[PDB]
């Protein structure tokens, strides 16, 4: 049952690889995840990871429930690094039952635990849930139970157990590392239809990490290694690039699935992700004050390109990792200056969620301002951008935005241009958009044609009598 396309990187690690740097007992020697080539291979040479890491059918693919934390089943799967993005997308949709998302919400930041102001908590974890409740979106978190990826899990917990509504299920996809997950043992069973349980132990872990409790689905990537951290990055960007290219069809109008990044406190690796996201043309949002790299960007966001005041402004990394601001490194500071300049240079692709000036509007509204600004700034050959924005607004089911942003602007439009959107709204039963289009002037006596009726009657409610 589809245990043959999803493979996992496994190979003996102590063929010949010592160092020794992490002596402990050995480099994951016999009676460990290393089990296949325990007899004598040819030489071993230098490990040099083209010493063939076997891709055999996966042994960790099932349904996981947390023993004494929650009681709802959760799906997971062990995935190799070289797995094509299309295979994972097919697995997530066709066999996990997930509907095609209307929006991707990438949540990045720092793994280290932290706290913010209670007002910021109460606004962020109340807006992030509502961004998804209305839209039917996906939340690609960081996986495990520490930091930004733990706070989003807390946000989902603050909803799915207080206002436990089946209508509008929260879909959070956890992408983490196999080899970093702590208790992956007792979770390996090559016939995986089992509802095994996870002992959520945060105390036992050393240089490892446990999975977060509140996550609808889990995706684990590995190279057959132990303790490595930078392995899930080049399968998250690759997956997101493909999901963004994938398209939705629905009733009458077809859209291109958008994507957004939501940052928080982050280290050197969050800044690089922010840079790589904006280069590909994906808008990102920064909150007004919680964290090392986020707050630097928030403060330098309206200034023109005149920088390297960063030597002073980087004090917000209060712990001063590598022991102070002048002694991070001259090379790393001069590298971060270029990155900050690059981020600030794309005005359209970047927005900052200034607390006092934008939270009263909402966080929801700014998190949809990012996508609309990106679509407006995209090159479109004339008029295509407005209709694409309307198509997105139909799927958002956000009539307030669809009005206040793409009908309060004075672009040229004829009432006939709304007919393909009018049909989609009628099929999807959104009377609020019907009212908006009638206010803007869609004359039904002219809109309702013979072919329009014929098409409408082929899209009745299948559950109707």
């Amino acid at each position: 049952i589809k245990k043959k396309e999803c493979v996992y990187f496994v190979e003996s690690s102590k063929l010949s690889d010592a160092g020794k740097v992490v002596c402990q007992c050995g480099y994951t020697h016999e009676q460990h995840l290393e089990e296949a080539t325990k007899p004598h291979t040819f030489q071993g040479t230098q490990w040099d990871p083209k010493k063939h890491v076997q891709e055999m059918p996966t042994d960790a693919f099932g349904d996981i429930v947390f023993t004494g934390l929650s009681q709802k089943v959760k799906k997971y799967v062990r995935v190799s690094q070289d797995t094509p993005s299309s295979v994972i997308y097919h697995l997530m949709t066709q066999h996990w039952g997930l509907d095609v998302p209307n929006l991707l919400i990438s949540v990045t930041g720092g793994a280290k635990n932290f706290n913010m102001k209670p007002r910021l908590k109460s606004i962020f974890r109340r807006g992030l849930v509502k961004v998804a409740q209305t839209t039917g979106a996906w939340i690609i978190t960081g996986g495990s139970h520490t930091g930004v990826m733990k706070q989003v899990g807390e946000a989902v917990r603050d909803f799915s157990l207080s206002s436990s509504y089946k209508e509008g299920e929260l879909i959070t996809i956890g992408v983490a590392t196999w080899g970093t997950v702590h208790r992956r043992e007792g979770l390996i069973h090559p016939t995986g239809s089992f509802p095994a349980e996870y002992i959520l132990d945060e105390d036992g872990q050393g240089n490892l990490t446990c999975l977060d409790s509140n996550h609808s689905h889990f995706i684990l990537v590995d190279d057959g290694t132990h303790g490595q951290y930078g392995v899930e990055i080049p399968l998250r960007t690759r997956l997101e690039k493909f999901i963004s290219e994938q398209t939705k069809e629905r009733g009458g109008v077809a859209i291109k699935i958008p994507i957004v990044c939501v940052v928080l406190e982050g280290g050197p690796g969050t800044l690089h992700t922010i840079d790589n996201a904006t280069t590909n043309g994906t808008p990102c949002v920064v909150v007004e004050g919680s964290g090392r790299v986020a707050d630097v960007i928030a403060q330098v966001a309206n200034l023109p390109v005149s920088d390297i005041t960063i030597s002073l402004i980087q004090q917000k990394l209060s712990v001063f990792f590598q022991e102070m601001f002048e002694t991070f490194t001259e090379s790393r500071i001069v590298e971060w200056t270029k990155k900050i300049q690059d981020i600030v240079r794309r005005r359209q692709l970047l927005t900052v969620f200034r607390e006092g000036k934008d939270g009263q509007q909402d966080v929801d509204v700014a998190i949809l301002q990012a996508l609309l600004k990106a679509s407006r700034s995209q090159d479109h050959f004339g008029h295509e951008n407005w209709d694409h924005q309307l198509k997105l607004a139909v799927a958002w089911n956000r009539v307030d935005i669809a009005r206040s942003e793409i009908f309060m602007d004075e672009w040229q439009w004829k009432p006939s241009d709304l007919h393909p959107t009018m049909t989609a709204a009628l099929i999807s039963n959104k009377p609020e958009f019907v009212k908006l289009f009638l206010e803007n002037g869609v004359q039904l006596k002219e809109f309702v044609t013979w072919d329009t009726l014929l098409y409408l009657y082929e899209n009745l409610d299948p559950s109707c009598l």
Partner: peptide
């Protein structure tokens, strides 16, 4: 009235490059 008091509870929290 209930929808307008909600509109008021939220209203009171407002306190070179050429290279």
């Amino acid at each position: 009235i209930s929808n307008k008091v909600d509109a008021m509870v939220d209203l009171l929290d407002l306190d070179g490059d050429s290279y």
